[PDB]
Every structure is written in C-alpha cells, then in structure tokens.
C-alpha cells in the first residue's frame, strides 16, 4: 500500500527545499538558503541539515507545516527520502549511503515538564530544563547485516527496534533458515548514543513540591552538547519506551504497589504484562544559560577599528581611562588591573624547568573604599574568571579535597576555586581569614603553577595555572600610617614575596 | 477470598470456584455448552461483584517477662483472625486468646528446603481483652455517689498530695505542685487568635538520692498520658516516627517532625542535662504548644504538640555549691530555663 499522504508531503518538502528562494537583504537578490547549505556540506563534508520551523511555517500554511509537525514519526522516512532524492539530484558524491540528519529549530513556543501529556506522542515539541547527569558515548546498532549460517547467504539492511532483532527468512530457495544468523560486525553501521537527564527549574516549581524528572536520548552530532548544571532547550519528538525485559531477549531475565497499565495476550509476551514509560528524543540542543588566526576573521570594522586603535598616538592615555567607568578615582589600580589582564609571556627552559609568567596583585585599604567593585568588574569582564571568598563552606576550600562515599568505591578528588580558575583570573575576597592548610598550599600554588596531593591511596599532580587578585582589610579596621605593611598586616612574609604589586 | 466467580461472556451459567489455600490459580476454559462447542466463545473473566469475600487480619503475640526462664529470650507467635471478631484487639494489652493451633506450609517461601519442617500459626476463636478500661470518665451512678463522697470529704488536694507516693517521705510542696500540674492551667485560647496553653512546665532540681526519679515513676503510673523518655538509649522516641521503615513492604510511613504522644501528653525526662543537641532542639521546639515542622522529604504533617513538660536534673558537680546559684543552674541555656 502506497502512503500517498507521505508521498505528497515528501514532494512538497523537496519542492520548497528546491525553491525556497528567500531574500535576506537588498544585495541578496536570490540566495537559496538550502542550496547554499548543500554547497556548505559539499565543501566541508557534513551530514546534518538545519531547518527553521518558521521558514517551514508559511509554506502551504498548515497543510504542510502542521502535517509535518504533528505526525512527525509518521512522515520522517518520507522526508528522509525527499532529502536523499534532492541531494542525489544535486550532489551524488556527497552520499559517499550516509546517515543524513535533520534538525528543526525555532519553534513558536516551549513547554514545561509538568505540561507533558500523552496526547502529543509522536509530535514535534520543544522543552527546556537543567541537565543533571549524562552518560558515556556508546555505539548503537542502526542497520544490521546477517549471515545465514547453514548456507552462508547474506541478509542485510535489517531495521532494528528497542530489541535486538534477527531476520526471519532466507531468500535462497534451497534454504529455509532453520538455523539462525550471525551478525556481520564489519558490515553493520553504528551510530552514537548518549542518555541525559533533565528536571524542572526552580522558577516553574511551586511550593516545596518534588521536581519532576524526565529522560532524554541524544543521537548523532548532538553528543556531549548538554553539560551538567546547564539550562538548555531541547527540540525533538516525544516518544514512549517499553520494558524490554518482558520482551523476548537472548539473555536471562513506590514500585511494589504495582497498578501499572499492563497489557497481555500476545504471542511473544506469553503470560507477562508489558509496561511503558515516557521518554523524550532530541535532535537539536541549544543553551540559554596566533595573530594570523585572529586576522582571518576579516570584516570592514575588524580591519578599520583595529588599524585605528593600533596607529593611534595616545592609546595608553585612553586605555586606562576605559577600565571600570563606574568606579570613582583610584587611577593607579585601573592601570594595575589592565596590566594583570594583559599578562606576561610564559617560557620554559631547555631542560624542562618552568617559569612563572603571570602577575599577582593584592589590594589593601580601609573599609568601604570601593575595593570589591574592581573584583566584581574583573569577574564580569575577564573570561574564565571565578569569584570566591577567603573562607569557604565547602570542604574543597581553595585548592582541592578528597571525598569518598561511605563503603562506596569512589576515591575521587573535588576541585577548588583555584582548580576551576585555570587559564584565568581567580578573585579572592577577605584574604585575611584563611586557615593553615590553604595558607600553606597557596605559596606552592602560585610559584609552581601546580598542586600535588597524596592521601588515602590516591596521588596526583594537578595544573593550577592561575592569575590571582586578592583584597585585604588592615588589622584594627583602619590602616595605621605610622607603621609599615608588615606591621599592619597579619599575613605572613613568604606570601608577601609571592605577590608582584601592592 | 472465599468463593471466586468468573463470568462467561453471556454463555449460560457463570462458573464458580472456591479455594481454601493461601495460593490461587485461575481457570482457562469453561463448561458452558456453547463454549464447550468445538470453537471458542468468549474468554472467561473474574467478576468482583459475584465473588464472596471476608475480612482478614494478622497479629503476633509475645511472652510475658514473668514467664520467661532465666537466661533466655522470649519467643513469639502468629495469630490469624477472620470474620466479625476483626479489630477486637489493640497493640499493647494482655489478652487470653483461645483458638485452633494449625500448621502452615513452607512452600510459600519457595526454597525447596525443609522437606518436613513447617511453620505454625493460631486461628483466633475467642478473645478476652482483659487488662483495664480508661472509659473516658463516662458517667455512671456509682461514680456519681463517689463524687458525692468526695464532696462530703471537704478539702481534697492535701489528702491527694499525701496519697500519691507515701513511699517517698516528706516533700509536701512538690506533691502539691504535681497536683497543680495534673489539672492544667488556663487554655482554649483568647480573643483575636492569640495562643495560650493550659500545660504547666515544672523542672525539679536536686542531688542524687532524693527519690525524685521514684516520684517521677509514681507520677507516670498515676497519669494515664504519662510517657518517660531520656537522652538516646532508644532512638525511635524523638524526632522520628515509630513507624519509620516498619512495614514489610518498606513503604516509608512517616509523619516527619513529631514526638511520642506529644498531643495532650505528660512527657517525663530524667537526667535533663544528658540529652544531645537533637532532643534539646525538640524540647525547645515543643515550647508553648508550638507544632514541630521538621521536614526531610517534602513531608509537613506536623504533630500539634500540646504537652506538659516535667523534667528532673542535677548539677554536674553532684552537690550544691556555696557560690552563685546560677553558676549551678541546669547547665542549659537561660532561654530554656526561663
């Protein structure tokens, strides 16, 4: 039976892929977004395509856009066939036969996790939440090839499902596939696979209710695109996953209350009941929370402004004036912070001795004279910058710590602020009240750029390439002009030699 | 279940079955004539309305401490009860149960061991509740003449104080304070919703060996709502429900933040300085009829604590000191003392 509806939607899809012909600007008379895209894949040998849902909106109105969005699972192979048809009409050698992928983006609205209901199963949807855990990138069987052992005939292109399925017949007339098949690994094609977990934000959750959790499955080029702790927006199709354990498998076989929506009466089920649960499949992920290389990023403004502020006569006189316009006064501190941001060259000796190539600055003064403002500005301006306090509630503190679950084989280290501040600027506030362990680890952290630890059977040497900036309050509240830095401050002499400017 | 009935999809009579075993198996085909015909006519389905059911309950009983031989651990016994006698007994009473002592198969565990060893249980037939009855002072003629006699007795509270603990000598004022504690103070709120409690909180101080512990035990005996607790020793007495992780299904039954019968209860504590920070926080939380709202997993079923607090303690020196008495105090924060 020919699903002419699928054929019609595929024909319309390939049609507006052919002749979308939207214009971007006046100079862009006819630009052909998807022809340019296919040329892009031609010149960079890619496999995925991106389709804007709004660009899909006006084509045939809801007879096409809605007919694709709602029964997406029903018409996905038809869209794949249309894409293959157009690409092999316009670019044969690109096929060199490959798993083309389509990612729809820019949906009209996003849904909360608490708004998920079964009536949208198989329909395109957009959801967002915080990623709390991911998994490894495992290979997954997609198209299998099998050998008919008793006759060694080949049956291939066997589509798979939630269960590992073998063929059911042999084309050889003399054979009747009484014996089973052996999988041809070098003939089958695998695809990447990763499972991530999401949950509702604190904004949507009312009262002290328990957050709702959902499981999202990635596939293709979207692997490792959602790191834990990130609020991201997922676009994909809602699906349902069964319990494969009750399903036939070669291997051996809140919850105690049961009352699940089981089903019985099938052949392979036997006397078992099949259960289901809701999971989401994603195809597009976005997040909402050398000098020649730089010169390669060419633009008119890139050339003009760079040349202008290189050939100027009074860059410095202006440059220091451009740092932290909010604060009042404190001319020298701005220059010091600018020099700290610029940094120093890093060199290594011929025999492998390393040289410290950064600038460490301490700021001292009586309370309320706008010292924390500089730290906040540099945190908000310098990339890979971390704000932290002298006294930290975490066991990591500043450098690192070791933790293990009670009678659980972890033996894992936890990263301190200095560890997170790698290749950046660490900003410590209230430097005075540190404790002994950090106070003795620091004067190794700065000068040697590395931290070493050996506790309870685990030893390691971690990189700590950081530029430090600290603030302090003189003992007694107000700085005593009669005495010196050593007299007023209680911080130790060896730490004093570490710093470069005051 | 006693008799299990199946419907036959409008095929004549609806097949019945009765199973007296503790396991049950269903039917597959039916004796209906058109169903007995050589092709299938409808799948038989169990009918809930047509079946006959019965109430079922189980309980276990322990040996009395007087009957245990020396150097042994008391044993238990399982009791099954069915019918109209269900819910005729409550935990924590002495009973005289008569029943039939029956064996029970081990095959329910399904271990394929103990070829001749079997489990045993008793099926209840008649229960004598025994023990005593509180009766909630339900008025009867005899107690009416009793209260008439009390009216004729004149002044009563002095005799009541004299009659609580004659084994402990003297200390008339302490017993008078105990009487005043038993009745309770002004209660049932005031205008515009301001909270007032009728409970009285009295703390007793003294050196060891003054029979204050014995007096506390006598008070607990005479007060039907009295409860005795102490710092640890038993863990399920403070900040945790008595049913936590209790059911065999491990259903995690819990109220959250609650104490032992703190609603209209008389809490008695010895060694008031002994308890750790958790029980100290609980006793500070139960202040002035304040409810306990400690949450752990989204639970907020607070226990409305309206209790009178009676505690006995001693200074760490073990003897009174000539120096400033607040230096002896209770070794507790002054806010709790006030």
């Amino acid at each position: 039976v020919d699903d002419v509806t699928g054929e019609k939607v595929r024909e319309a899809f390939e049609q507006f892929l052919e002749d979308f012909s939207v214009q971007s600007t006046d100079t862009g008379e006819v630009e052909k977004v998807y022809r340019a895209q296919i040329e892009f894949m031609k010149i960079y040998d890619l496999n995925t395509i991106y389709i804007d849902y709004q660009h899909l909106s006006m084509r045939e109105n809801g007879a096409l856009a809605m007919a694709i969005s709602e029964q997406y699972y029903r018409f996905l192979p038809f869209l794949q066939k249309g894409l293959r048809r157009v690409v092999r009409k316009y670019a044969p050698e690109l096929l060199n036969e490959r798993v083309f992928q389509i990612s729809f983006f820019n949906l009209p609205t996003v849904h909360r996790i608490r708004d998920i209901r079964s009536e949208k199963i198989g329909s395109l949807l957009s959801i967002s939440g915080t990623v709390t855990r991911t998994s490894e990138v495992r290979p997954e069987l997609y198209k299998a090839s099998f050998t008919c052992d008793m006759c060694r005939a080949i049956v291939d292109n066997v589509e798979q499902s939630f269960k590992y399925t073998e063929p059911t017949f042999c084309p050889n007339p003399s054979c009747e596939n009484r014996a089973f098949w052996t999988l041809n690994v070098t003939r089958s094609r695998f695809l990447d696979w990763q499972k991530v977990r999401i949950q509702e934000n604190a904004n949507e959750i009312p009262t002290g209710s328990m957050p709702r959790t959902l499981d999202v499955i990635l596939r293709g080029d979207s692997v490792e695109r959602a790191k834990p702790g990130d609020r991201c927006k997922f676009t994909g199709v809602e699906i349902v996953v069964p319990d494969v354990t009750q399903l036939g498998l070669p291997g051996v076989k809140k919850t105690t209350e049961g009352l699940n929506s089981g089903v019985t009466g099938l052949r392979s089920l036997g006397v078992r009941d099949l259960t289901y649960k809701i999971s989401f499949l994603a195809c597009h992920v976005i997040s909402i929370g050398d000098q020649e290389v730089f010169l390669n990023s060419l633009s008119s403004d890139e050339i003009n402004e760079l040349k202008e502020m290189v050939k100027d006569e009074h860059i410095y006189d202006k440059l220091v004036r451009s740092i932290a316009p909010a604060v009042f006064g404190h001319e020298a501190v701005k220059k010091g912070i600018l020099l700290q941001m610029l940094g120093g060259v890093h060199k290594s000796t011929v025999e492998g001795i390393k040289l410290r190539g950064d600038i460490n600055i301490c700021v001292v003064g009586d309370p309320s004279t706008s010292k924390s403002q500089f730290l906040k500005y540099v945190v908000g301006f310098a990339p890979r910058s971390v704000y932290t306090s002298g006294k930290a509630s975490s066991a990591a503190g500043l450098t690192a710590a070791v933790v293990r679950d009670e009678e659980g084989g972890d033996y894992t280290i936890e990263a301190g602020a200095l560890m997170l501040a790698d290749n950046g600027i660490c900003c410590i506030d209230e430097f005075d009240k540190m404790d002994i362990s950090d106070q003795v680890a620091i004067h190794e952290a700065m000068e040697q750029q590395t931290i070493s630890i050996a506790k309870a059977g685990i030893h390691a040497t971690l990189n700590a390439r950081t530029s430090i900036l600290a603030a302090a309050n003189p003992v007694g509240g107000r700085y005593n002009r009669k005495l010196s830095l050593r007299g007023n401050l209680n911080m130790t002499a060896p730490i004093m030699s570490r710093f470069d400017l005051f | 279940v006693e008799v299990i009935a199946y419907t036959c999809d409008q095929c004549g009579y609806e097949v019945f079955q009765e199973v007296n075993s503790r396991t049950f198996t269903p039917l597959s085909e039916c004796t209906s004539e058109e169903c007995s015909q050589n092709q299938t006519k409808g799948q038989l389905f169990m009918s809930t309305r047509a079946s006959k059911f019965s109430a079922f309950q189980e309980c276990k009983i322990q040996e009395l401490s007087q009957q245990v031989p020396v150097g042994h651990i008391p044993r238990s016994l399982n009791i099954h009860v069915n019918g109209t006698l269900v819910r005729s007994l409550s935990p924590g009473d002495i009973v005289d149960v008569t029943g039939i002592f029956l064996p029970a198969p081990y095959t329910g565990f399904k271990a394929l061991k103990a070829g001749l060893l079997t489990e045993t249980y008793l099926e209840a037939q008649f229960v004598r509740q025994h023990k005593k009855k509180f009766a909630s002072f339900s008025l009867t003629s005899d107690v009416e003449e009793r209260v008439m006699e009390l009216i004729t007795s004149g002044d009563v509270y002095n005799r009541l104080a004299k009659s609580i603990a004659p084994e402990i000598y003297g200390n008339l004022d302490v017993k008078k304070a105990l009487l005043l504690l038993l009745v309770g103070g002004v209660d049932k709120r005031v205008g515009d919703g301001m909270k007032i409690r009728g409970d009285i909180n009295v703390c007793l101080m003294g050196d060891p060996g003054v029979a204050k512990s014995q007096l506390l035990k006598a008070i607990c005996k005479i007060s039907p709502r009295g409860v005795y607790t102490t710092g640890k020793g038993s863990s399920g007495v403070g900040l945790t429900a008595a049913v936590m992780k209790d059911p065999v299904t491990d259903e995690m039954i819990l109220e959250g933040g609650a104490l032992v019968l703190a609603d209209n209860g008389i809490c008695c504590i010895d060694e008031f300085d002994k308890m750790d920070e958790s029980d100290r926080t609980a006793i500070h939380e139960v202040m002035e009829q304040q409810t306990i709202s400690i949450s752990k997993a989204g639970i907020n079923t607070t226990l409305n604590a309206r209790t009178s607090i009676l505690a006995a303690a001693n200074p760490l020196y073990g003897r009174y000191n000539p120096r400033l008495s607040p230096l002896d105090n209770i070794n507790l924060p002054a806010a709790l003392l006030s």
Binding site: P139, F162, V185, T412, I413, M419, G457, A460, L462 | -
Partner: protein, 97 residues
C-alpha cells in the same frame, strides 16, 4: 584485564572521569601497576551484551581495548627528547659510548 580511568591532569576541572576496560595478552602481564599513569596503544573493538541492552532499552554495544603497547608516564612528563616505549633503555653503541 584492568580498569582505566581518565588522567586527573587531562580531565576538565569539576567533571567526572570516564572508565574503560583494557585487556592484556601474553608478555604484557603485570607490566602496569595500580596507581601508575600509563599510555596504551591498542585496538578498539565492540561486542554484544545482554543487560546493557536490558537497562538502556536500545541495542547498545560494550567496548573494550585490546592493548598492544604500554608506555609508563609517571612523573617524567618531558616527552620530547627521544622516542620509544622506554627512554631509559640503551643500545650497544650507546653502551660503547
């Protein structure tokens, strides 16, 4: 066979390491030691597994690494002076020199 983690100096800070399984054939036995950071050249292979499919609900395959060469990289991070599995080994002409 042995369990291989990620080097703490290579993992991005604040993240979790990734575990793999390494299989050592003859002549490779006891060459590596617990706690010693190593570098293994080997062959990547995949195979079927039951409970991995059971718990994931998808035809996922387990992967192991059949080792072919092992080089110790504990302490001495300077890895540019000379090439070879062991930089502390000498030839006959080097002995003559």
């Amino acid at each position: 066979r042995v369990t291989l983690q990620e080097a703490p100096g290579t993992v991005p800070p604040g993240r979790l390491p990734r575990h793999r399984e390494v299989i050592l054939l003859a002549d490779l036995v006891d060459v590596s030691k617990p706690g010693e950071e190593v570098e293994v050249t080997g062959i990547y292979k995949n195979n079927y597994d039951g409970n991995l499919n059971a718990k994931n609900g998808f035809p996922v395959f387990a992967t192991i690494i059949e080792a072919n060469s092992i080089k110790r990289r504990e302490g001495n991070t300077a890895n540019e002076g000379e090439e070879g599995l062991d930089v502390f080994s000498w030839t006959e002409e080097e002995e003559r020199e």
